[PDB]
Design a protein around this nucleic acid. Structure first.
Ligand SMILES: Nc1ncnc2c1ncn2[C@@H]1O[C@H](COP(=O)(O)OP(=O)(O)OP(O)(O)=S)[C@@H](O)[C@H]1O
Ligand SMILES: Nc1ncnc2c1ncn2[C@@H]1O[C@H](COP(=O)(O)OP(=O)(O)OP(O)(O)=S)[C@@H](O)[C@H]1O
Ligand SMILES: Nc1ncnc2c1ncn2[C@@H]1O[C@H](COP(=O)(O)OP(=O)(O)OP(O)(O)=S)[C@@H](O)[C@H]1O
Ligand SMILES: [Mg+2]
Ligand SMILES: [Mg+2]
Ligand SMILES: [Mg+2]
Ligand SMILES: [Zn+2]
Ligand SMILES: [Zn+2]
Lengths: 563, 79, 232, 598
DNA sequence: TTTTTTTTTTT
């Protein structure tokens, strides 16, 4: 009559409760008794147990978790409600959640077969959408109706599930119960959609996608445009309209960035100067003290491009960024600089853009002929499920605070170069559509490459006649690098030598100092200062603005895109 | 606005062409005043020429073959 | 659309072919059907369908006599004569005086050469013919005649037909949002003859859509719903 | 019916001999197959259900007529003849059996209802696939009172609830626990009949196939397969509520076996593991043929043995079938590097251009053929379609991405308005494609190689104008090509006489498997690396090209050409298996680049 | 009865 001991679950609950107390760090001082300390102040309810340490302390256990992770999850959470009663200030009906991390072996969204349901996996991908956060009923307390009793602790499974039996021999309604909602147990619930990462795409294929379901204090870790790394279990989900048809869903428990630039834990100079490991900080200092730095970042960022020494400099100064200011009235000065390149055929334009977009993190790459207006900036999509018009983020938004690389900028249509100017001016994106009214921020820096009208750049006209951009756009860039293929012969030896060298010594002949991983660190560090202007420098600046206008002065010469 | 004579415009709802009788079809026996006789749309000026010629407007286009009697008086001012 | 009041909309009917009459009729085809006329099961108004008992193709304006199409020895008499080739030539559109030689070529167009395939290199076995000439020489009469003397034929005018309406067009269904293919003139006239008069007045971007059908005799579509090659 | 068939099948599997040749008598044919299955993984046995037509005729009636009540017997009767290697290697899953047919059996238009539920073979061109769909096999129930968990099996094709707890007997308390049950996979694919084998003046059909547990991801859109599987028909319900089913059923195909290996085309890149499956008798042949002083001109001249001389164009189209090395530039941050060759053919009419495209397209596997006006901007690369069921925008692949390993023949290159022509700029130089539309922001990639054909402007090569004026293409597009072959029509009477004498011959009436295997080999085990003597002839070969192409006004030379020479030079070395680029491999692929524009 | 994307006829 009485229930059955799910032995494989309770034995695991017991051993996990033991592990939580016995395991200690390098200096005694049991570690899951101090991380579990902050677990009492409100809004914290997830303990993050590393999985490699559960491998040290035990191994007959890891093979039970990693193979029954759905059977034994409802117990690895009760065995955390007992271990934390030693604080006495937790509300007695509060519930906690275990969140693993640092699994050994990874997987791919295409290896998620149906032989993986109920196990413990680990997945990496991008993030496309993020729905809003909701409550979700985990265990309802049905207030009985005729008995005025309380049927209690009834578990829902993807539906309302209406338990229909009462422990009272006189329960006039085995089909009617009004549940309360001030004692029942709710948990947050966000549902996002992830898309196969770039480095896994089999050639000639469109990327797949799946639904992940964040269900805890982890509920707004992943945002759109990020490259998080989820670790949970694959589950099946029915179609509740007819409760069949099943569909796969990932049920994540922990989520963390895929490659931390600072491996400590994940916003000013000190917060970051804390995570700097000893070698990291003794190297960043060495660079910051280096002289001729401004020539060893160019030579180390673009190692396979002979010449154009005046373009690499501009690209660097674009990567570092200026100081973004907000006027007291409520307006805002643009902080980051935009850069456009214009040149003859085959002059290494798309190579600067490919370099920048593969080096930088959170920088997007798009062509111009294969884009749209509502695809760059922001869209509006009818979710018939919610039957509402919601906002979709565009390339100018999921590259925020990064760099948007637009190739072939002058192939875009007439109406698609308008939406981009409306964003490049005010740094924002307005939306006024079916039932949506919003204003979104966009603090991207644009790196664009274009082609002169009729192939070659004609050096007897102004710019406005050599390119077919609009008039307003050409004003919002303020750095142009016209490249020309001067029909010379001393270069045509140098470029030849460099290309054949690169192709003969494929991975060598590249002798850059300051390896690429290191420059990311230096650039994440040095991008948190706000330099000021001394009075002498202000005088110098106004004098230079004086000496620039008059060069365009009448009589002697002439120039293009007047100052 | 719509014009002086009739037009054939692609209706958003119907996605097809519909007929817009302008002013000279609404003025029944009345009088129509015009200024700047070189500003009016080329097509519109052609059609007003024919309307003062015949005293009716008959458009034969995409899905429209109708006639509208124009009975009004033109008081034009040139430049 | 001929036997409709001057500007009225044609009405349709539904035919439930089943059993053995299936696969007889092709879409876009003249046909004659014989069957009961019943209402549909499941207030008092009713929707009706025709329940076909017999389907006969009437393309030739009379019937399909492919079974009785065998010739007689009394006709082999003619076909064996010395100048059988020259009788037919004179018996093509006899209402038209002269043009003794043009009618000799419009017959070769109806008979057609042979088509090879050596080492996998197709060679077409059809013949194409143009009739450049002054006004009023009865060209649109010759073409109207060669239209009726062909089992599968089509008639098209250069100034009243667009380049996607000759080859094949991709069109959407506002009921399903799904793009489907729809054959043009050259597809519906697969094993037959197509006739295009007013050929110098066809728009220049709507005329290069024939260079494909005149040599390789396929139509290769790669629009945004479909990617295929129809046989024309 | 069950015991009577395994006994008759084991015999076949043991005593069978064929008058044939495999992998370039070893009597135990299927026993040798079953031995190979044991020496490696892959527990599938590809049996040809025509061999079983020679050895027998009363199982070949019962395999294509009751296939679902037979194929389990054909598995069991193979598990036991696995006795030889039972103790040696013990794999886990099971052994399998997969009947098929070398040649098709039906079309997609002649599937009649006397063929429901019986083995059937068709052929087509896969259009699109779907994501996996679970499918329950073993239920797992659990009571709310006794909390006792029984596990009922699905036997007939439906799941029945017990309704009595073996302990507490509450007469209905057994809920179904979903995520504790067992599922299997299922994918939905769509075929499309080939242009050949369809009636006069009609449009292609489609047929829905359902894959299953292990065949679940073995095919890609853009492939030409010979699917073999049962043919089933299941009812549908007018309401998703009532049990009033319709009377017109709905059919699909439970696939059992794929086959992508067609005889006439080269080896697709699924057979790189199969290159190690070459007879060592054959590698001798290849290595020895690769030593004759002219194996280049001897293989080239064996392409399309119906075109007349045109000696250089066949050289170019032969080097295109090998391509430069696949170097790995991930370290230098440069990105990736194109290794395939794009070829353009321009020349006045009648010069047999479209025949060369029609020949290549029928040679290479994974290819396409497009035209001028019947192809749009998005139909070539990637479009966005309102998916019908889920009412959501989903991405699809065009033609330049379906090829992806092979050649994308684009005839009528001139007659494409400049919009849809400026799309090739990305996919043909970087081997990528960056899409940013309504909800889709992604970046595909492909390894295609264009082979285009155009006509001069005015369609007549008038020698009054300059070479950069008969073509009338921009420079930012002419430089992405690296072999611009200008065919012309000179009026030499000797040439006309020889050509006519050749063409008439086509009206009366080297091997392939040498070329078809030489190519697979030269792809699998070759990687030419440059030298220092070759690299020193590549620098001057670019410093002269500039002075030459500058004045004449024919076609300028930009540094991109200096990479093409590499692409060509290496591609020449692969022809002779030289594994190292030397001097002559630059002079040849320089004379080729120079003597094509004249 | 709304967006967004893609093809073809029309002013
Ligand atoms: N100055 C240079 N130094 C080194 N390599 C160069 C240089 N200029 C061009 N190249 C090489 O030549 C090619 C240039 O092609 P891209 O830069 O991709 O084209 P692009 O400059 O964008 O011109 P278009 O307008 O797009 S054809 C690449 O393979 C470069 O490696
Ligand atoms: N030799 C002829 N024999 C018989 N009828 C003729 C002859 N020449 C002219 N006709 C008649 O003259 C008229 C010619 O009209 P069409 O046949 O339309 O001319 P056409 O050759 O189409 O001229 P275009 O190209 O359209 S201006 C028809 O009524 C013919 O019957
Ligand atoms: N050298 C040749 N060898 C073999 N056949 C040839 C040769 N030259 C011409 N032909 C034949 O002549 C015809 C030429 O047709 P195509 O190959 O289509 O020419 P094309 O280049 O496509 O013409 P345009 O420019 O596109 S109209 C075919 O029937 C070929 O068989
Ligand atoms: Mg470029
Ligand atoms: Mg006429
Ligand atoms: Mg051609
Ligand atoms: Zn009760
Ligand atoms: Zn029970």
């Amino acid at each position: 009559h009485l229930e059955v001991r799910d032995e494989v679950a309770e034995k695991c609950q017991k051993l996990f409760l033991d592990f939580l107390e016995e395991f200690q760090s390098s200096d005694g001082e049991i570690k899951y008794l101090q991380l579990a300390e902050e677990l009492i102040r409100p809004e914290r309810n997830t303990l993050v147990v590393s999985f490699v340490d559960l491998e040290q302390f035990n191994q007959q256990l890891s093979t039970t978790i990693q193979e029954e992770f759905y059977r034994v999850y409802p117990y690895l959470c009760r065995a955390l409600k007992t271990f934390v009663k030693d604080r006495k200030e937790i509300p007695l009906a509060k519930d906690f959640y275990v969140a693993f991390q640092d699994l050994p072996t990874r997987h791919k969204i295409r290896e998620l077969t149906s032989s993986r349901i109920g196990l413990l996996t680990r997945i990496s991908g991008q993030v496309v959408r993020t729905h809003p956060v909701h409550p979700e009923l985990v265990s309802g307390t049905f207030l009985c109706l005729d008995c005025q009793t309380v049927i209690r602790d009834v578990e829902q499974q993807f539906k309302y599930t209406q338990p229909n039996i009462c422990r009272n021999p006189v329960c006039a309604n085995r089909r009617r119960f009004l549940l309360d909602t001030n004692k029942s147990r709710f948990v947050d619930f966000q549902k996002v959609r992830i898309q196969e990462t770039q480095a896994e795409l089999p050639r000639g294929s469109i990327p797949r996608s799946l639904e992940v379901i964040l269900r805890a204090e982890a509920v707004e870790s992943a945002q759109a445009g990020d490259k998080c790394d989820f670790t949970g279990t694959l589950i099946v989900v029915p179609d509740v309209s007819k409760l069949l048809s099943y569909r796969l869903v990932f049920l994540a428990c922990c989520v963390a960035p895929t490659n931390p630039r600072f491996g400590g834990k994940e916003q000013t100079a000190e917060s970051i100067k804390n995570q700097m490991t000893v070698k990291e900080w003794e190297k960043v200092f060495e660079m910051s003290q280096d002289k001729n730095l401004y020539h060893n970042l160019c030579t180390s960022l673009f190692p396979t491009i002979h010449g154009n020494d005046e373009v690499k400099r501009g690209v660097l100064l674009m990567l570092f960024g200026g100081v973004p200011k907000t006027t007291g009235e409520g307006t805002s000065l643009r902080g980051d600089i935009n850069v456009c390149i214009v040149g003859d055929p085959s002059t290494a334009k798309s190579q600067f853009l490919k370099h920048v977009e593969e080096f930088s993190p959170r920088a997007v790459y798009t062509s111009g002929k294969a884009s749209s207006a509502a695809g760059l900036t922001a869209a509006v999509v009818r979710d018939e499920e919610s039957h509402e018009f919601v906002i979709e983020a565009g390339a100018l938004m999921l590259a925020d605070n990064g760099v948007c690389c637009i190739d072939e900028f002058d192939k875009m249509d007439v109406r698609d170069q308008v939406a981009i100017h409306e964003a490049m001016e005010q740094q924002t994106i307005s939306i006024t559509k079916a039932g949506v009214k919003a204003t979104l921020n966009a603090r991207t820096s644009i790196l664009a490459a274009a082609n002169p009208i009729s192939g070659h750049y004609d050096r007897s006209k102004s710019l406005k006649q050599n390119i077919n951009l609009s008039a307003p756009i050409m004003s919002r860039f303020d750095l142009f690098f016209i490249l020309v293929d001067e029909c010379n012969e001393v270069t045509d030896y140098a470029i030849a030598r460099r290309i054949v060298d690169l192709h003969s010594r494929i991975e060598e002949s590249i002798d850059r100092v300051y390896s690429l991983d290191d420059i990311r660190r230096y650039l994440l560090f040095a991008r948190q200062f706000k330099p000021k202007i001394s009075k002498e420098s202000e005088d110098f600046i106004v004098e230079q603005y004086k000496h620039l206008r008059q060069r365009d002065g009448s009589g002697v010469t002439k120039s293009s895109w007047r100052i | 606005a719509a014009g002086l004579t009739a037009s054939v415009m692609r209706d958003p709802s119907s996605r097809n062409f519909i007929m817009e009788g302008g002013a000279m079809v609404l003025a029944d026996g009345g009088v129509v005043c015009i200024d700047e006789f070189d500003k009016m749309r080329e097509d519109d000026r052609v059609a007003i020429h024919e309307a003062m010629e015949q005293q009716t407007i008959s458009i034969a286009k995409a899905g429209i073959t109708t006639t509208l009697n124009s009975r009004c008086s033109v008081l034009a001012a040139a430049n | 659309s001929d036997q409709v009041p001057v500007g009225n909309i044609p009405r349709s009917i539904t035919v439930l072919v089943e059993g053995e009459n299936t696969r007889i009729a092709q879409p876009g085809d003249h046909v004659s059907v014989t069957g009961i006329f019943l209402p549909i099961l499941r207030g008092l108004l009713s929707e009706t369908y025709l329940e076909a008992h017999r389907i006969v193709k009437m393309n030739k304006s009379e019937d399909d006599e492919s079974g009785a199409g065998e010739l007689t020895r009394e006709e082999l008499r003619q076909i064996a004569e010395e100048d059988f080739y020259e009788k037919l030539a004179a018996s093509i559109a006899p209402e038209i005086y002269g043009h003794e030689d043009v009618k000799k070529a419009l017959l070769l167009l109806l008979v057609g050469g042979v088509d090879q395939s050596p080492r996998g290199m197709k060679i077409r076995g059809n013949i194409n013919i143009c009739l450049m000439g002054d006004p009023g020489v009865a060209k649109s009469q010759l073409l109207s005649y060669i239209d009726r003397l062909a089992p599968r034929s089509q008639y098209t005018t250069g100034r009243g037909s667009s380049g996607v309406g000759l080859t094949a067009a991709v069109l959407r269904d506002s009921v399903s949002g799904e793009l489907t293919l729809e054959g043009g003139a050259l597809v519906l006239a697969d094993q037959g003859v197509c006739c295009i008069d007013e050929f110098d007045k066809m728009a220049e971007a709507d005329r290069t859509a024939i260079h494909e059908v005149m040599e390789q005799q396929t139509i290769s579509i790669a629009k945004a719903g479909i990617l295929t090659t129809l046989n024309a | 019916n069950v015991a009577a068939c395994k006994e008759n099948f084991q015999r076949f599997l043991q005593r069978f001999i064929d008058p044939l040749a495999k992998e370039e008598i070893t009597e135990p044919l299927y026993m040798q197959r079953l031995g190979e299955i044991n020496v490696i993984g892959e527990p599938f046995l590809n049996v040809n259900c025509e061999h079983i037509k020679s050895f027998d005729k009363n199982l070949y009636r019962q395999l294509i007529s009751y296939p679902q009540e037979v194929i389990p017997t054909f598995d069991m009767a193979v598990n036991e003849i696995f006795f030889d290697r039972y103790p040696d290697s013990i794999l886990e899953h099971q052994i399998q059996v997969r009947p098929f047919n070398a040649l098709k059996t039906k079309n997609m238009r002649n599937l009649n209802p006397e063929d429901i539920d019986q083995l059937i073979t068709i052929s087509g061109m896969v259009i699109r696939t779907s994501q996996l769909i679970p499918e329950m096999q073993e239920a797992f129930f659990q009571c709310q009172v006794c909390a006792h968990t029984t596990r009922v099996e699905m036997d007939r094709g439906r799941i029945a609830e017990p309704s009595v707890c073996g302990r507490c007997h509450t007469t209905h308390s057994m809920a179904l626990i979903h995520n504790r049950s067992l599922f299997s996979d299922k994918q939905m694919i769509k075929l499309q009949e080939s242009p050949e084998d369809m009636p006069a003046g009609q449009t292609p059909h489609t047929v829905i196939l359902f894959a299953h547990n292990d065949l679940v991801d073995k095919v890609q859109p853009g492939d030409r397969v010979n699917v073999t599987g049962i043919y089933r028909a299941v009812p549908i319900r007018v309401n998703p509520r009532v049990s009033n089913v319709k009377s017109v059923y709905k059919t699909h195909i439970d696939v059992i076996h794929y086959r992508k290996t067609d005889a006439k085309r080269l080896h697709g890149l699924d057979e790189e593991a199969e290159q190690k499956l070459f007879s060592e008798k054959r590698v001798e042949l290849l290595k020895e043929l690769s030593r004759k002083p002219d194996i280049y001109e001897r293989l080239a001249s064996a392409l399309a043995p119906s075109i007349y001389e045109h000696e250089d164009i066949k050289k170019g189209i032969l080097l295109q079938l090998f391509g430069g090395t696949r170097k790995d530039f991930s370290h230098t941050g440069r990105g990736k590097f194109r290794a395939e060759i794009n070829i353009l053919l321009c020349g006045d009419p009648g010069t047999s251009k479209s025949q060369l495209l029609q020949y290549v397209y029928n040679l290479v596997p994974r290819g396409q053929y497009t035209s001028g006006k019947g192809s749009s901007a998005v139909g070539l690369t990637a479009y966005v379609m309102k998916d019908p069921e889920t009412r959501q925008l989903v991405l699809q692949t065009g033609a330049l991405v379906l090829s992806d390993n092979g050649i994308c023949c684009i005839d009528e290159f001139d007659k494409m308005n400049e919009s849809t022509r400026s799309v090739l700029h990305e996919v043909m130089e970087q081997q990528t494609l960056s899409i940013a539309k309504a909800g889709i922001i992604c970046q595909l990639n492909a390894r295609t190689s264009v082979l285009a054909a155009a006509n001069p402007i005015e369609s007549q090569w008038n020698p009054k104008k300059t070479t950069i004026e008969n073509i009338q293409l921009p420079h930012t597009l002419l430089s992405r090509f690296d072999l611009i072959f200008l065919l012309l029509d000179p009026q030499d009477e000797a040439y006309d006489r020889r050509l006519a004498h050749h063409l008439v011959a086509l009206y009366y009436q080297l091997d392939m498997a040498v070329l078809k295997d030489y190519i697979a080999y030269a792809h699998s085990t070759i990687m030419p690396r440059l030298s220092e003597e070759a690299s020193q002839a590549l620098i001057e070969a670019y410093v002269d090209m500039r002075k030459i192409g500058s004045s004449r006004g024919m076609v300028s030379a930009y540094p991109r050409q200096l990479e093409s020479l590499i692409r060509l030079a290496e591609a020449h070395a692969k022809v002779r298996l030289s594994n190292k680029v030397e001097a002559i491999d630059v002079e040849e692929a320089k004379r080729l680049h120079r003597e094509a524009l004249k």
